Homo-oligomer: A and B are copies of this chain.
Amino acid sequence: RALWFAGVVFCFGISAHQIAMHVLDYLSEPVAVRIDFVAQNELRIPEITVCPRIFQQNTIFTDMVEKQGIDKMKFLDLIDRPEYDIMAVWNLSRIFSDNVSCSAHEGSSIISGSYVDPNMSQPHLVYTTSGQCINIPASRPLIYRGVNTFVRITDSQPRNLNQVRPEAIQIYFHEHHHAHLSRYLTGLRGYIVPIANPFAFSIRFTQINYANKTDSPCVDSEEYAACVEDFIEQRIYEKAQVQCRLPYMRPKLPLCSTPTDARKIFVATDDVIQNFEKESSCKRKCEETLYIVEFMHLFERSNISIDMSVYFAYNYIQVATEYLTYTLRGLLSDIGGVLGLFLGICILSVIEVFEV
């Protein structure tokens, strides 16, 4: 009976190996991606940060610093003079007046006309590494009534001919409550547009709903934003080796009073915002919206200085949803199948063996 026992042990070994592999596969939680094209009646506007060009590319700030006798690429030296402070050095980069309106034109009606909703999340002041910027929270989702839906950022500043006036701005569309993106990466990930002519963008939406797993955990939008903001600030402070902050930093430490400290912080933040995408520690989000930006063309030319439009005309959002493809039912079915192939013992056999 030696051969029969050898066959029995071989069958037990193969069955044990197969059940172990099945259980490991279930534990790994394999996932599959379902791609849908969902048409919504209300689009979630991305948060918009409109900055001036970076300090070096900015024309007004560069002209001011040259007028003060200090060449660009080293503007931070302005902090040395008692009449200039970092807050003032960064308020000099302001490009939008107090008359900044963010209208929301949601389609049109064949009987009444076009809907205009000027009371749409009026822009507020933010401090970016590019200077002083305008942030536009997405207070409510825009009702999509047609390809005429858009958001119009318009500033009618008294653009007199006495002084040189801006030739470009940097507009960045990002997640709703990502303070780090608005205050650090607008200068890098913001599309440059001229204000001389009324511009118009177009936004398509690719939503990605990842899956929360043991090896790829999730964090809500707030958790991810807080994680990345804290990581960026702590990394900047570690790199700069200084107790400081700059207008683009949370009120944690006091502003620098000397150019050296500010320049060290600036270099540190440059390196961080450059290399933080891969070296960040906190986990990804599983509600990740991508705003594909195309370039519309405007037939209507307005006389407002900084007329700007962003059109949301495509309501078919591409939703990529990740779902678990292996369940407990499937694992039990596969285990029972392998048993019926190799061992051929149900739980009744186990009960009989245990009793005896």
Contacts and interface: CB of A to CB of B under 8 A. Distances in A.
Interface of A: 4, 7-8, 11, 18, 21-22, 25, 32-37, 39, 41, 54-57, 73, 107-114, 129-130, 145-148, 167-168, 185, 187-194, 196, 202, 204, 206, 208, 266-267, 269-270, 273-274, 277-278, 290, 292-297, 299, 313-314, 316, 320, 329-330, 332-349, 351, 355
A316 B188 CA distance: 16
A53 to B, nearest CB: 10
A333 B334 contact: yes
B329 A340 contact: no
A179 B111 CA distance: 21
A222 B308 CA distance: 42
A320 B73 CA distance: 44
Q: Which 7 A-B pairs have the closest CB atoms?
A: A336-B341, A344-B346, A340-B340, A337-B337, A146-B188, A194-B299, A336-B337
Main secondary structure of the interface of A (DSSP, over half): mixed
12 contacts: A57-B108, A145-B274, A146-B189, A193-B299, A333-B338, A333-B341, A339-B340, A342-B347, A343-B348, A344-B345, A344-B346, A344-B348
Contacts of A113: 54, 56-57, 73
A35 B295 CA distance: 26
A295 B201 CA distance: 11
A341 B34 CA distance: 32
Given A11-B348, A37-B206, A108 B342 contact: no
Contact of A295 (B193, B296, B316): B296
B22 A329 contact: yes
B341 A346 contact: yes
A191 B337 contact: no
User: Which of A32, A294, A336 gathers the greatest number of chain B CB atoms within 10 Å?
Assistant: A336
Contact of A147 (B56, B190, B269, B334): B190
Contacts of A148: 188, 192
Nearest to A351: B7
B37 A34 contact: no
Contacts of A267: 111
B351 A341 contact: no
Nearest to A314: B292
A108 B186 CA distance: 12
B110 A191 contact: no
A32 B31 CA distance: 11
A11 B293 CA distance: 58
Contacts of A332: 18, 337-338, 341
A218 B338 CA distance: 33
Contact of A337 (B297, B299, B335): B335
Contact of A336 (B204, B313, B314, B340): B340
Given A334-B330, A337-B337, A348 B7 contact: yes
Contacts of A187: 108, 110, 146
